Amino acid sequence: ADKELKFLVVDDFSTMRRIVRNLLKELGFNNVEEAEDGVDALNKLQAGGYGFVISDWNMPNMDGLELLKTIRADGAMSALPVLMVTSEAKKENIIAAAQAGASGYVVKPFTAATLEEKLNKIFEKLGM
Ligand code: BEF
């Protein structure tokens, strides 16, 4: 994928954002911004430029399922890749997110290999 692709990484806790930012760096993506909830995220996204979203689920103000839904229902960003990265591991949660249009779904805790594999699966599916 284009190493200039701009990422938005969303989670209400810094620890996970920091893990993801560093992994993306390892992979060669340095264009990376962070948000703390779904509202914060939409704000940054509306500022334009983003090519990929990685997002947590449980967050105040707007959770990640709502953020995913919002993104997919906006005409300007409806096809934006959205990778869920979350502690929610129940099959019903995965169904809900998949049905809502998730590009992928990774369960915390995750290894560096898992994140890289799931990211690449999305690249390949979208011809990126
Ligand atoms: F807070 Be997340 F859903 F792990």
Ligand code: BEF
């Ligand atoms: F927008 Be969803 F994928 F129906």
Ligand SMILES: [Mn+2]
């Ligand atoms: Mn924090």
Ligand SMILES: [Mn+2]
């Ligand atoms: Mn959270």
